[PDB]
């Protein structure tokens, strides 16, 4: 529409300072004041109710932690390994499909330059389905210090799929992440109101898993799981680790929050060695450090985002992504001091306080006319004159 | 009023195209916007404070998926059978009177004809307060193949229902169900404020039921059971099946939602057997296959809607009703693919997260002069020029 | 100011008739938009925050029924006995000062009229510091069939309360309610901010209602009392009954919602058989025949309201009472067919779901940054042209 | 701004009459409207997501009172014990950085002064950044029998806060209050949003608080533990008190509410004896006497407020603190009254229901399109004419 020009006006100039961007959510807000309509409905949608996208953050508030004090934390470091590698954070970029949505002209290229480019370095996990071929992206990469993981969404026609894994392989891409978690649609209204799957093979099973395991080096890690049972299945096979997600809520909807399956998952790991055996990633509604350090107090490897990297790139590309990171680092560095901990090692379950991680309710229906007719209290008022 | 006219604008030419319809709600939105004030007021009016009828939604939201992943979902299965029939959807039509308010012209003859025109064909409940005759209703059906229940309030005449039971099996109806939670009136104070039970035995007994037995060849389901201690008698009495329901919340306010007597109930029948001698349905609060889904996983033989399909039949007619059909339809296998099954059949509790099933919560009342004082967060703005 | 005959306006003519009066909370709003404020502010008012005023009707919606079918309710019987005499209904109007607030022609003589008049007699607890005489309030009862109770506020000066009990036990007032939960002042912060207890003895004891029984032939029944360990000291010194109450939260905030505390002390007086030989009435919060119902299901012998009938008398008078006793009396009945019982006896814990009792809540403060920038979905739209 | 005069006109004369403030809320209004927008910003505010600092206010309404009744409570007494010194009031008014933000002339001085002055002393807590000098502070005092305590911030160079313990201990403090939580930032997005630590000593630790016993003979407490934990190690490095703080939610964002913390430890402390060899005191989100009451009964030895007597100060100066005093002295008199309690000692937790105290919750998402088109019921409206 002519309005598009009505975001020109926002989009150039109005938009503030990187440097007067104080949290993720207002990457957020910027991005849907200046995202295209049909680029909006598509990053910020979920399937259906949107029930489970929402339900992923609300679950953080569910733990609450247990800080300790009059610990000294001049020092703290918040570096750690996932899958093989040594990284600066113990968070990531998720793979989200079509970039230049949201950015037309580098898209999956800004992501992996702000990843790679500033001091510090966050390993960008790689969309099959990305606005970009697999091989710019990879060479976008402003560092060989930096991590570059591959998200695979298996084919119908394997051999396109086979041919996939080798040249993302050559490619030197670290890691395979098979995302489990889309086998059929999970629609997205508010995209679909906007109009008005062959790629991804429904046939997947683990026993392709495990023939995976022959075609590649690269370590696997089957993402989107959203079960214990699996979480356990996916160490029998041996595959290198499992992500517990339901695609940021995009797929069916009333599936828990990963945070609230990796607290119940865990401990049985715990119970069977299987723990170290298995790297166990988490995403879905992080926005802030302390998010990170719940799912990180409970278990996870590593944290990762979608929507908050994937806004940000879309409203200041490569440099958005850059503050992206630099504004959630110092997030969780700080929130790990008054924690009373020095390091990721340290972020352990005992600073938690998961008594009430089930508190997961459903009122009962308002009474409208007791609550309409009803006037509450008031404040004491000024003079008028 | 002359604003009859005003909906004329509105249901003539204005109304989105049927293909534009996205979900059940959408069927409501334009329905309220359209149908006549009488109408409107007596579909969507629940008893007193419309808790229960809007309870019976909110409890479904207690229940969360443990989806499995890794399971070849290319082909998947709803048809299931009912009362000795098969049927190709778990879900059913379920019996609302007086759909002329909404339907003038065709009323219950649309919904028959939606119901089994299309590819997809869905058992239609026949009211005995529709406001089409049950040989008209039971001659507009466009198929051989749909199923058609009658749905039997007992007259305080006996002899009137007795030649009803006559003429509807007669008329080749599939089943009866009696409906037992309207002995009274069930105050509906939307459409009481609109005006400014002969035909209802009040004293119907099990005994009554015991010898509607003996005068039928019919499946006997008792339609409107609130609590597990019925639903046993019912099975004691030797009846078909039960319908776990409240009226859609029309009659008894602060009645259980259904979904949460089922969960309560199965495993009581199981542990006695009945399970497979008594078919268990349910119905309130059902606008999407993810309800229908969590119903079918507790044991329920199939799922009914009343409101939803009222609301579509109002609006669109007997393409409406198709259209509501296709929703629903899809829906279902969708999710039915992101759980990991293929079957109704393998739809099992196993499936589902009941954790929180009885988080039915009322909180204490708000604090209204320390929110109200209380300035939250804000994103951070863009520049004025 | 010159508002008040803009209340004359609303209040003359613009009252809807009271036929057109569908419930309790109707006769609140009207109250509210004719009252005067210092009316209102006093009526309306609670201590403090008014949380436990609202608390009060908030914990009847964490018991839900479980209603019996299939049961022969043509017929049911709500009346029943309270302290030794029999009653139409089983509920009563409960004390409220200054009825000639509302009402400055008739005051507590109309409310005296109201329940007395028609078909339906309910008790009328008469309040210590009523606009009239105990004389003329109990001169004003139009039948010899309806039942008045004396609510005791115990003066400093006890020579003053001695003659009092003389006087209403002579003018022939079947029982002596004295209040106990009013010792100080429980501030009403809605007058307070308007005007911008000699009375009643802050030091009576268990000892003083010892020494009234001896002072009186009239049941006595302690008023206001807030834990079961009271409840049981009433039963040691032998008074008539009791009635759990906090004054309808115009006293201490944060006093359990008297049903609450129902729920938790019946069954220790049962286990102890003091349940016969004390009456536990209840009160507060009441607005709905479905309330009534929960508490006379749990124990309660009657079930007071102060408010609903306040507001009926300051609006229509004589009448509104009246109106205000048939409205809750048909809400009585007809949910108790629903139930499936025909008399107050059959009213038992049987019939209540109290699973979720105790699930009063308090979540944590809403994520503002997160829920704020969040667009949630939307309904299909008309077309616009 | 120019708009810093249209404060000028609400501050002047537009501020009602002291007296005319019903409660500590009311103070706060006055204040978000007449305070500088970045005094407001940095006494409203609090880390992060505020939800800390609001749930530590949440957190007290999970508790309910039990209520004695028929107690003389004509007599009640409030003073209490603290630190080894005898207060009037068993709540006191902890330390506030820069007060001359909201009282440019007098700042600290005019609330050591309102603490002071009237019949009724508060123990004033005196901060190390506060924008007046501890001298002219600890001079400003109206009374010798007033107390006042001494917050200290150990300095990375802890020679300075070697001679600023000599010099506080000098001038007469009673106590030093070491803030252990604020070892690092705790952002403020309030304030960090209007610009568009070597004092705190990161290194602090239990060895340096073992140190700080030798160079004092002031009682030492350890203010900002968030763990019964802690609680434990305080008591066995022998220090004085403890007080369960979350710096008023400014520091660790999701801490949990102290009065939340102090239900878990005093239990403890008393099944170790430690109870009286341990002074727990306990802060945030207390505004009003039953707040004080509910910490008073599970065990504190005093309740700290914060932002309460800042805004008070900040609008109406000594005499606002006075006010605010008198206020919150009346409202916990006044419901002691209604507990039937007539000393601290007697505030014991049997007098408080601690059942739903756990009940923390966090709701599923709302579905926003079945309460979207859902239409709630309506309070029977006026005649027109
Ligand atoms: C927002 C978004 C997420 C996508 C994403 C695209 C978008 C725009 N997609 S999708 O188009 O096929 O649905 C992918 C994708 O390419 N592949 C994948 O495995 N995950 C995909 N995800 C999910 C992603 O990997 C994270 O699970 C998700 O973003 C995490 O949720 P938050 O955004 O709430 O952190
Ligand atoms: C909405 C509605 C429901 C009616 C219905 C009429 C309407 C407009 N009515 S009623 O006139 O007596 O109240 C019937 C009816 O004819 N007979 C019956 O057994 N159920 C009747 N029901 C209830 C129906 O069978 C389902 O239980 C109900 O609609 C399910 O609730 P939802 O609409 O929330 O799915
Ligand atoms: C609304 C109201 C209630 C009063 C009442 C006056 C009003 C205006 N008052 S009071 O002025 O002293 O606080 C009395 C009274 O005279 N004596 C008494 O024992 N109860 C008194 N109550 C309380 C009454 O007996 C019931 O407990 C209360 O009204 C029940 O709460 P609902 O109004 O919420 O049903
Ligand atoms: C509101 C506020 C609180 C401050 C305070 C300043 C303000 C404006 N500050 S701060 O500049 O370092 O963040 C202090 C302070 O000087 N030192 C300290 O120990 N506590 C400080 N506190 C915390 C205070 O001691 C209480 O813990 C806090 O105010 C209690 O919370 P409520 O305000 O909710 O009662």
Same mark, same amino acid.
């Given at each position: 529409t002519k309005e598009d020009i009505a975001r020109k006006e926002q989009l150039k !100039? /109005? /938009? %503030? %300072? /990187?440097? *007067?961007? @104080? *949290?993720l959510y207002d990457f957020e807000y910027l991005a849907s004041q200046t995202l295209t309509k049909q680029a909006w409905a598509y990053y910020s949608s979920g399937a259906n109710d949107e029930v489970t996208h929402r339900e992923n953050h609300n679950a953080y508030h569910r733990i609450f932690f247990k800080p300790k004090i009059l610990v000294d934390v001049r020092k703290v470091d918040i570096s750690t390994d996932m899958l093989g590698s040594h990284v600066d954070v113990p968070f990531y970029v998720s793979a989200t499909a079509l970039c230049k949505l949201g950015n037309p002209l580098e898209g999956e290229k800004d992501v992996a330059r702000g990843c790679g480019q500033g001091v510090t370095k966050v390993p960008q996990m790689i969309s099959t389905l990305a606005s970009c071929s697999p091989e710019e992206i990879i060479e976008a990469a402003p560092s060989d210090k930096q991590i570059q993981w591959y998200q695979l969404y298996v084919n119908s026609d394997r051999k396109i799929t086979d041919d996939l894994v080798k040249n993302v392989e050559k490619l030197g891409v670290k890691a395979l992440f098979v995302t489990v978690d889309a086998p059929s649609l999970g629609q997205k209204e508010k995209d679909m109101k906007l #109009? =008005? !799957? #062959? =790629? @991804?093979? %429904? !046939? /997947?099973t683990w026993k392709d898993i495990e023939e995976l395991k022959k075609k590649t080096k690269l370590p696997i890690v089957i993402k989107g799981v959203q079960r214990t049972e699996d979480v356990i299945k996916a160490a029998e096979i041996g595959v290198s680790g499992v992500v517990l997600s339901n695609h940021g809520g995009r797929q069916l909807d009333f599936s828990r929050a990963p945070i609230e399956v990796l607290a119940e998952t865990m401990p049985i790991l715990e119970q069977r060695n299987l723990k170290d055996k298995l790297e166990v990633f988490v995403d879905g509604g992080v926005r802030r450090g302390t998010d990170v350090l719940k799912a990180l107090c409970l278990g996870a490897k590593g944290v990762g985002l979608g929507r908050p990297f994937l806004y940000a790139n879309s409203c200041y590309g490569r440099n958005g992504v850059e503050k992206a990171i630099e504004i959630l680092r110092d997030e969780i560095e700080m929130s790990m001091r008054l924690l009373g901990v020095t390091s990721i090692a340290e972020l352990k379950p005992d600073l938690l306080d998961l008594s009430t991680l089930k508190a997961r309710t459903v009122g009962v229906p308002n009474d409208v006319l007791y609550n309409e007719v009803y006037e509450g209290p008031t404040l004491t008022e000024f003079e008028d004159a």
């Open positions: !100039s /109005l /938009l %503030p %300072p /990187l440097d *007067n961007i @104080i *949290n #109009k =008005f !799957s #062959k =790629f @991804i093979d %429904p !046939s /997947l």
